[PDB]
RNA sequence: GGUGAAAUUCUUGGAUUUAUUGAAGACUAACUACUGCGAAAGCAUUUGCCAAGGACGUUUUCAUUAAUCAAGAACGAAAGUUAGGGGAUCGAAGAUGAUCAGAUACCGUCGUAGUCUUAACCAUAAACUAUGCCGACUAGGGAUCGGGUGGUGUUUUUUUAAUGACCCACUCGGCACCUUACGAGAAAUCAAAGUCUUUGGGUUCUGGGGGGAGUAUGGUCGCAAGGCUGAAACUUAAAGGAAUUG
């Protein structure tokens, strides 16, 4: 039977979207079906900040952040526990948190 | 724009087509405008300005060869030069184009 | 037997059947 | 005759006495009779003109390029061939070019070339279909045709000759230092076999 | 054993006058001698340095500047502006979803024969009181804004000799000009040149370099 | 009436030399025997006189072109590149 | 008051480079890699190998005159992971430990406009 | 370097790593979304040129010119074929290093074809919304794209004119979504898959248990690969769909 109304993807009005490559295994993925996450990390840590504040010129200069959009194939997102397989009623929920 | 002005002269005004009749009309002072095909040879073309400069009549340089100019004046042959004897319901003489 | 591989194998038999026939012809 | 590319007869006025001098250029594609050619350092960048290499931009396509300034054309003369100006070296003026064979050459910037590609291109695209067309092609060139295979000969005639079967018997790759009478085969071959990396 | 660090000379990098404090840093070279003298081992060096460092003010924490050494006098390497570029974390923090990114670039020559490509970036902005959540331009605004930006960038360059372009780039008066000339088409928030790359160098003009390095 | 199905002009070669070779010749012979528009007098009167020589039967103008066509694509690309660089020089 | 160099920490997976240069980057000063500090081939990219490989870099920066460093952290980039390896953080912390001053940390991972198709096949690297 | 761990491979002749400068070919990240356009296939850097198109607006024109369509045609991913060009990358074949009982697989490093383009072919995909097209009607809601209409509604520019952008309220058209189950369905589910034994709006295509078999044969198209058309003898009590408990 059919599992999802939005079959497994987000494409109603295209036919063809574009492929993207999985960051974990390089699998080719339609861009709308890819599981996308936004990793915003401190350039150093959550614990070496005090060390870098003590041992650096420019007191509390910037603490720059690292931005990268990750694209995951279905298999790698499930095996990395990014999407966490859900129940029939709970998979209809599109809320992030 | 230029083509529809040409079509209006052919429909409403009076005109002559071809080298010999154009030069005769340039001699007789009956020409208000000369349209010159792009691929008209340079000797004939300079001959046409020299005649036109003598009679103080405007020269417009058609963009397109004698096939295109013949089509523009509504003909099924090439015309390398057209002379406008008098504009009819057309503003071809008043508009700089 | 996957359906596309059975199709491929059947294309191989057909491709060689049309060669033995042309040979015997 | 014997040349694939057509020739342009270009008439110039002699600068030093009242008379006309004629020249035999190799016509570049797009050059027509009655066209004005301009040949000089101050010539325009138009097909057919003859310019020094140092006074044409990057990526310019020229033909009949001088190997040395004044030799009157050595490079890219066969139909459809051309030289690409790939760089300038203004101090001790040199121009880096790409030859039809793909080699990178350094020519003096004062050597001349003709803007455009040698006309008659695509000729070898048409198969000859038959010996007779090769006969007439070489009747106008030289006595290089037909060719008898060395293995088809006798040992007195060719190093490939002899044997109770037609075969070569030793390697066809011959050293560069072999002497005349030995250099039949693939001379100084760095590799052999179908070109397939 | 070699230990090449008992062999080099520790030169000092100087910045063009169109900045704050011109003391940038130090460069290690060699000990000069015959047989490939160390004098030529510098004339092409390019050093990136933050505009915040060479201006003192921290509001220039992004937008690093490339300074290329032109010649060597004494224990001093005189640098000239070689390029400008925003930092990566600045770009990435600036690109956000539910908005439009507009980018324009122009290749343009200065009053000098300095050929250089100017880039520019801008982002559609939500108006105050806006309820809709994505603030996108209508692709006619985008060409309108891009046409405005290109014209402004071409106008700011073609005067503004390299020294004047740098003195224009530091206080970001160009982005006030872009904003003033685009505020009607569509509101924008993060308007920046974001990059300058020099494509072709004019005559070396040692006098011009000395006009910046006193 | 359609006298041949596919050989066309290359039916003069009968059954010899191979169909692929005859097809290859056929494409280039049709090009080399075609009439082309004159860029000078605007008439379709340009015929080949020899490989690389294209002569307008009127206006007597002769141009140098491809072995089997008046203009080769390489020649067209070289024309555009030369024009582009010329305008860069003249800009 | 201080003399600056550049740390240029390349933190891939399976290795980490601590490559201090001058400001220009033309002159290397103490390039030490994680593979130098361990012999197991499992942990060249480990934080401990990075700790040791940045400790001896800074022990070399001193006695040569570099007292402060601008840090450029790098991932493999191109068509690869884009995520800084485990060793990059230990190497940065090791530089701060070692008395070297720090200024202007930045990430310089080469990020294309997607280009030059990624290795692995269409179905990806499946194990 | 590479991996889970390694080998293979490069490396004191300097590998990897740093910097400056080039060359080539491909791709067009982020922005990029339950958003857009296209007949579908598909289509994402700028700018110019060219022809086209939907929707909207309309107190313009024509006046049945229309719907669907055997035959007949144009287009039609990728792979593949031919001949040039290009050939950075990745990479059916192949090589090689591993793993294992074996591994001619997965993993590693290379690597021809191919990947790109031009001129021709081919005509097939889970070419899918697995949902023919045209028309009408049956329920509530909010968001969104394009056009329009209306607010003594905000906002910048001279302080506010306007315009833009935004807000609100309507309206046509569109991609969708949410709730409910009128109603439908075997159910999953579905605003169409509803207005069906209370069975008829128009029209095209296709199916008739599972295999044999999309096989054989003939025809036709194609350079080929193959495509379209397409049985039977024989064999069989199931095959299958959806859901439930384990
Ligand atoms: Mg299932
Ligand atoms: Mg599709
Ligand atoms: Mg022979
Ligand atoms: Mg014999
Ligand atoms: Mg982009
Ligand atoms: Mg859009
Ligand atoms: Mg039909
Ligand atoms: Mg089908
Ligand atoms: Mg179907
Ligand atoms: Mg839509
Ligand atoms: Mg039945
Ligand atoms: Mg049946």
H or E element, residue B52: helix B42-55
What token pair was written down for E201? 């160098």
Asked if E121 and E101 touch (Cβ cutoff 8 Å), the reply is: yes
- E11 burial via Cβ count (<10 Å: 0-12, 13-18, 19+): buried
- E69 near E48, Cβ under 8 Å? no
Give me the number of domains chain E comprises. Answer: 1
* Secondary structure of residue E194 in the 3-state scheme: strand
Beta bridge partners of E105: E119
DSSP run (H or E) holding F87: helix F73-90
d(CA D166, CA D161): 8
Angle between helix axes E173-182 and E141-156 (nearest 10 degrees) is 140
- In the block, which residue shows the tokens 């008051």? G1
Tokens 């044409």 sit at which residue? Answer: D56
CB atoms within 10 A of CB F50: 10
The residues that bridge with D20 in the sheet, in sequence order, are D13
Q: How many residues does chain C have?
A: 25
Tokens of D113: 């070339």
Element (H, E) at F48: strand F44-50
Residue length of chain G:
127
Q: Cα E135 from chain centroid?
A: 30
Report d(CA G57, CA G36) in Å as an integer: 12
Residue D137 phi, psi dihedral angles, 5° rounding: -65, -45
Q: Which chain E residues in 180-209 sit with Cβ < 7 A of strand H?
A: 180, 183-187
Ordered strands of the F44-50 beta sheet: F36-37, F44-50, F53-56, F62-64
Closest CA to E24 of G23, B3, D164, B85: G23
User: Gaps (C–N > 2.5 Å) in chain E: which residues precede them?
Assistant: none
By residue range, what is the domain housing residue E110? 6-214
The residue whose two tokens read 């695209």 is D125
The kind and range of the H/E element at G93 are helix G87-97
Q: Protein A7 CA to nucleic acid H189 C1', in Å? A: 14
* Side-chain half-sphere CA neighbours of F80 within 13 A: 5
Please state whether beta strands G68-74 and G9-11 pair in parallel, antiparallel, or not at all (unpaired).
parallel
Best CA proximity match to E87, nearest among E123, E45, E125, E49 = E49
**In angstroms, what CA-CA distances link E23 with D40, E16, G4?**
52, 10, 12
Q: Which residues does F18 contact at the CB level (< 8 Å), separation at least 6?
A: none
Strand-pair partners of E65: E49, E84
Query: To which residue do tokens 């000799």 refer?
Result: E161
Tell me if D86 sits within 8 A of D96, measured CB to CB.
Answer: yes
Helix boundaries (H) for chain E: 51-55, 88-94, 141-156, 162-169, 173-182, 206-210
End-to-end CA distance of chain D: 40
> In whole angstroms, how far apart are CA D145 and each of D142, D149, D187?
8, 12, 21
The gap between the terminal CA atoms of chain A, to the nearest Å, is: 29
Residues 6+ apart with CB under 8 A from E137: E100, E102, E124, E145, E186
Phi-psi region of D102 (alpha: psi -120 to 50; beta: other; left: phi over 0): left
User: What is the three-class DSSP state of C10?
Assistant: helix
Q: Give the span between the Cα atoms of G91 and A43, in whole angstroms.
A: 13
Say how far apart CA E33 and CA E51 lie, in whole Å. 36
Is the CB of G81 less than 7 A from some atom of nucleic acid strand H?
no
C-alpha–C-alpha distance, residues D98 and E69, integer Å: 34
**Which three-class secondary structure string do you get for chain D?**
CCCCCCEEEEEEECCCCCCEEEEEEECECCCECCCCCCECCCCCCCCCCEEEHHHCCCCCEEECECCCCCCCCCECCCCCCCEEEEEEECCCCEEEEECCCCCEEEEECCCEEEECCECCCCHHHCCCCCHHHHHHHHHCCCCCCCCCCHHHCCCCCCCCCCCCCCCCCCCCEECCCCCCCCCCCEECCCCCCCCCC
Q: Does residue E55 fall inside a structural domain?
A: yes
Cis amide prior to D146 (ω within 30 degrees): yes
Q: Give the strand pairing for E64-73 and E76-85.
A: antiparallel
Buried b (16+ CB within 10 A) or exposed e, F19-34: eebbebbbebbebbee
Which parts of F5-72 fold into alpha helices (H)? 19-32
Work out the end-to-end distance of chain B between its first and last CA atoms, rounded to an integer number of angstroms: 9
Whole-angstrom distance, CA of residue F65 vs CA of residue D31: 8
From the list E13, E24, E87, which residue is nearest G106 (CB)? E87
Coil vs helix vs strand at G76: coil
Residue E117 · residue E197 · CB < 8 Å: yes
Rounded CA separation E198/E206 (Å)? 18
Q: Which chains border F (3 or more CB–CB pairs < 8 Å)?
A: B, D
Q: Experimentally, how was this structure solved? A: cryo-EM
CA A48 to chain centre: 25
Q: Where are the domains of chain G?
A: 1-127
Interatomic distance E197 CA / H158 C1' (Å) = 38
Interface contact F53-D6, CB threshold 8 A = yes
| Distance in angstroms (rounded) separating the CA atoms of residues A31 and A28 | 9
In the structure encoding, which two tokens stand for residue A83, read together? 């999407």
Task: Compute the distance between CA of residue D111 and CA of residue D96 in angstroms, rounded to an integer.
Answer: 12
Pairing of strands G68-74, G28-33: unpaired
CATH of G1-127, one of 3.40.50.970, 3.10.580.10, 3.30.420.80, 2.40.50.1070: 3.30.420.80
Give me the phi and psi of F12, to 5 degrees please: -60, -20
Gap between the Cα atoms of E214 and E15, Å rounded = 10
Cβ-based interface (< 8 Å): residues of D facing F: 4-6, 8, 27-34, 44-47, 56-61, 79-80, 82, 115-117, 119-123, 125-127, 129-130
Counted residue by residue, chain E has a size of: 214
Task: List subunits contacting chain A, requiring 3 or more Cβ pairs under 8 Å.
Answer: E, G
Strand H nucleotides with an atom less than 7 Å from a protein beta carbon: 1-7, 16-21, 23, 25-38, 40-48, 82-83, 88-92, 106-109, 111-113, 118, 129-130, 143-147, 153-157, 162-168, 175-179, 187-190, 193, 213-217, 225-226, 241-243
Neighbouring residues of F63: CB distance < 8 A, sequence distance ≥ 6 = D30, D31, D32, D33, F39, F46, F54, F70
Sign of the Cα pseudo-torsion (E67, E68, E69, E70, in order): negative
Q: How many other C-beta atoms lie within 10 A of the C-beta of residue D161?
A: 18
Q: In what order do the strands lie in the sheet with B58-61?
A: B14-17, B81-86, B33-36, B58-61
CA distance G77 to G14: 15
- Bridge partner list, A72: A35
In CATH, the number for domain B1-97 is 3.30.1330.30
C-alpha D68 chain-centroid distance:
16
Distance CA(A38)–CA(E93), nearest Å, equals 12
Resolution in angstrom units: 2.2
The pair of structure tokens assigned to F33 is 């025997």
Residues in contact with F57: Cβ distance below 8 Å, sequence separation at least 6, in sequence order: F45, F46, F47
Q: How many CB atoms lie within 10 A of CB F42?
A: 23
How far apart are alpha carbons D138 and F82 in whole angstroms? 36
Note whether F43 contacts B65, CB cutoff 8 Å.
no
Q: How far apart are CA E185 and CA E204, in angstroms?
A: 42
**G79 contacts: CB under 8 Å, gap ≥ 6:** A21, G112, G115, G116, G117, G118, G119
Report how far residue E141's alpha carbon sits from residue E186's, in angstroms, rounded to the nearest whole number. Answer: 7
Distances A75 to A6, A72, D187, G123 between C-alpha atoms, Å: 18, 8, 58, 11
Q: Gap from A81 CA to H240 C1', in Å? A: 36
E42 located within any domain: yes
**Token pair listed for D109:** 């910037």
Cα B69 to chain centroid, rounded: 9
Please say whether the beta carbons of D66 and D43 come within 8 A.
Answer: no
Chain A residues whose beta carbon lies within 8 Å of the beta carbon of residue G96: 48, 51-52, 54-56
Measured in whole angstroms, how far is the alpha carbon of residue E56 from the centre of its chain? Answer: 16
- Give me the sign of the Cα torsion angle D152, D157, D158, D164: positive
| Helix (H) or strand (E) segment spanning residue A35 | strand A35-42
Residue D121 burial (CB < 10 Å; 0-12/13-18/19+)?
A: buried
**What are the residues whose beta carbons fall under 8 Å from the beta carbon of E87, sequence distance 6 or more?**
A64, E61, E62, E63, E64, G106
Instruction: Measure the CA–CA gap between E141 and E137, rounded to whole angstroms.
Output: 6
Which are the contacts of B91, defined by CB distance < 8 A and separation ≥ 6? Answer: B5
Hey, what are C24's tokens? 């015997």
- Give me the residue spans of the domains in chain B: 1-97
Task: For residues B45 and D12, give the distance between their C-alpha atoms in angstroms, rounded to a whole number.
Answer: 26
Q: For an interface test with E, give the residue of G22, G25, G59, G107 to mutate (most E CBs within 10 A).
A: G22
Name the one residue in this structure whose structure tokens are 């000098």.
E112
Residue E115's SS3 state is: strand
d(CA D88, CA E183): 47
Q: How far is CA G104 from the centre of its chain?
A: 15
Q: How many CB atoms are located within 10 Å of the residue B35 CB?
A: 24
Beta bridge partners of residue G4, listed in sequence order: G68
Q: How far apart are CA E164 and CA E111, in angstroms?
A: 10
- Which tokens in the block code for residue F82? 């030369």
Residue D68's Cβ-count burial label (10 Å; 0-12, 13-18, 19+) is exposed
Interatomic CA distance for residues D106 and D67, integer angstroms = 9
Phi-psi label, residue E148: left if phi above 0, alpha if psi -120 to 50, beta otherwise: alpha
The radius of gyration of chain C from alpha carbons, rounded to an integer in Å, stands at 11
Cα gap F54→F67, rounded to integer Å? 9
Q: Taking CB atoms and an 8 Å limit, are D59 and F85 in contact across chains?
A: yes
CA neighbours closer than 13 Å in the CB half-sphere of residue D8 = 29
Q: How far is CA E17 from the centre of its chain?
A: 15
Residues (146-175, chain E) with CB within 7 Å of strand H atoms: 146-147
Q: Which residue in this structure is represented by tokens 């390095």?
A: E213
Q: Are D160 and D168 in contact (CB under 8 A)?
A: yes
């Amino acid at each position: 039977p059919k599992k999802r109304a939005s079959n497994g993807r987000n494409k109603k009005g295209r036919g063809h979207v574009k492929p993207v490559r999985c960051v974990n295994c390089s699998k080719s993925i339609p861009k709308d079906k890819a599981i996308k996450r936004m990793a915003i990390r401190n350039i150093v840590e959550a614990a070496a900040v005090r060390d870098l504040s003590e041992a650096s010129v420019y007191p509390e200069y910037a603490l720059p952040k690292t931005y990268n959009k990750l694209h995951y194939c279905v298999s790698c997102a499930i095996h990395a526990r990014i999407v966490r397989v859900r129940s029939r009623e709970d998979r209809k929920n599109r809320a992030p948190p | 724009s230029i083509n529809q002005k040409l079509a209006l002269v052919i429909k409403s005004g009076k005109y002559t087509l071809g080298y010999k009749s154009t030069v005769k009309s340039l001699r007789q002072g009956k020409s208000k405008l000369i349209i010159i095909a792009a691929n008209t040879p340079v000797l004939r073309k300079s001959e046409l300005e020299y005649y036109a400069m003598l009679s103080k009549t405007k020269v417009y340089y058609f963009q397109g060869g004698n096939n295109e100019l013949g089509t523009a004046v509504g003909k099924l042959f090439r015309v390398g030069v057209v002379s406008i004897l008098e504009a009819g319901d057309s503003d071809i003489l008043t508009t700089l184009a | 037997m996957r359906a596309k591989w059975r199709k491929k194998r059947t294309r191989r038999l057909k491709r060689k059947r049309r060669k033995v026939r042309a040979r015997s012809k | 005759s014997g040349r694939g590319a057509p020739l342009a007869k270009v008439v110039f006025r002699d600068p030093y006495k009242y008379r006309l001098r004629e020249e035999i250029f190799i016509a570049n594609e797009g050059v027509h009779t009655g066209q004005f050619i301009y040949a000089g350092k101050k010539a325009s960048l138009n097909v057919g003109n003859v310019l020094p290499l140092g006074s044409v931009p990057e990526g310019t396509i020229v033909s009949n390029v001088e190997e040395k300034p004044g030799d009157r054309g050595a490079l890219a003369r066969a139909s459809g061939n051309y030289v690409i100006i790939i760089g300038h070296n203004p101090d001790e003026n040199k121009t880096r070019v790409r030859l039809p064979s793909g080699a990178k050459k350094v020519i003096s910037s004062d050597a001349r070339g003709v803007i455009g590609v040698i006309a008659g291109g695509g000729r070898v695209d048409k198969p000859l279909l038959k010996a007779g067309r090769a006969f007439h092609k070489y009747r106008l060139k030289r006595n290089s045709w037909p060719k008898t295979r060395g293995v088809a000969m006798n040992p007195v005639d060719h190093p490939h000759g002899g044997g109770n079967h037609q075969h070569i018997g030793k390697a066809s790759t011959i050293s560069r230092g072999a002497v005349s009478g030995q250099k039949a085969g693939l001379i100084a071959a760095r590799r052999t076999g179908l070109l397939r990396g | 054993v070699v230990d090449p660090f008992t062999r080099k000379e520790w030169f000092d990098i100087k910045a063009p006058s169109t900045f704050e404090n011109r003391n940038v840093g130090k460069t290690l070279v060699n000990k000069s001698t015959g047989l490939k003298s160390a004098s030529d081992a510098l004339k092409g060096r390019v050093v990136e340095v933050c505009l915040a460092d060479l201006q003192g003010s921290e509001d220039h924490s992004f937008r690093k500047i490339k300074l290329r050494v032109d010649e060597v006098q004494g224990k001093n390497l005189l640098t000239n502006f070689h390029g400008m570029d925003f930092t990566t974390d600045k770009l990435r923090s600036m690109v956000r979803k539910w908005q439009t990114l507009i980018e324009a670039n122009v290749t343009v020559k200065t009053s000098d024969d300095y050929v250089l490509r100017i880039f520019a970036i801008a982002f559609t902005r939500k108006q105050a009181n806006q309820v809709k959540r994505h603030s996108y331009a209508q692709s006619s605004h985008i060409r309108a804004i891009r046409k405005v930006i290109s014209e402004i960038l071409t106008k700011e360059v073609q005067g503004s000799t390299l020294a004047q372009l740098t003195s224009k780039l530091i206080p970001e008066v160009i982005n006030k000009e872009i904003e003033n000339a685009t505020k009607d088409i569509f509101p924008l928030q993060n308007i920046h040149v974001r990059k300058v790359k020099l494509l072709k160098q004019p005559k070396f003009d040692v006098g011009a370099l000395m006009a910046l390095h006193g | 009436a359609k006298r041949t199905k596919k050989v066309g002009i290359t039916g003069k070669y009968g059954v010899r030399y191979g169909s692929s070779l005859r097809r290859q010749v056929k494409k280039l012979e049709i090009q080399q025997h075609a009439r082309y528009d004159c860029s000078f007098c605007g008439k379709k009167t340009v015929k080949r006189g020899a490989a690389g020589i294209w002569t307008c039967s009127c206006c007597k103008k002769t141009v140098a072109g491809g072995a089997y066509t008046v203009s080769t694509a390489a020649a067209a690309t070289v024309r555009s590149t030369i024009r582009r660089l010329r305008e860069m020089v003249e800009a | 008051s201080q003399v600056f160099g550049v740390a240029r920490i390349y933190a891939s997976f399976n290795d980490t480079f601590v490559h201090v240069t001058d400001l220009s980057g033309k002159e290397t000063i103490a390039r030490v890699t994680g593979g130098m500090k361990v012999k197991a081939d499992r942990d060249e990219s480990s934080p401990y190998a990075a700790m040791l490989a940045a400790q001896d870099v800074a022990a070399k920066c001193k006695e040569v005159g570099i007292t402060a460093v601008h840090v450029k952290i790098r991932a493999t980039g191109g068509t690869r992971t884009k995520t800084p390896g485990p060793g990059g953080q230990a190497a940065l912390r090791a530089l701060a430990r070692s008395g070297l001053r720090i200024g202007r940390i930045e990430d310089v991972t080469p990020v294309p406009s997607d280009s030059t198709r990624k290795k692995g096949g269409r179905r990806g690297r499946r194990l």
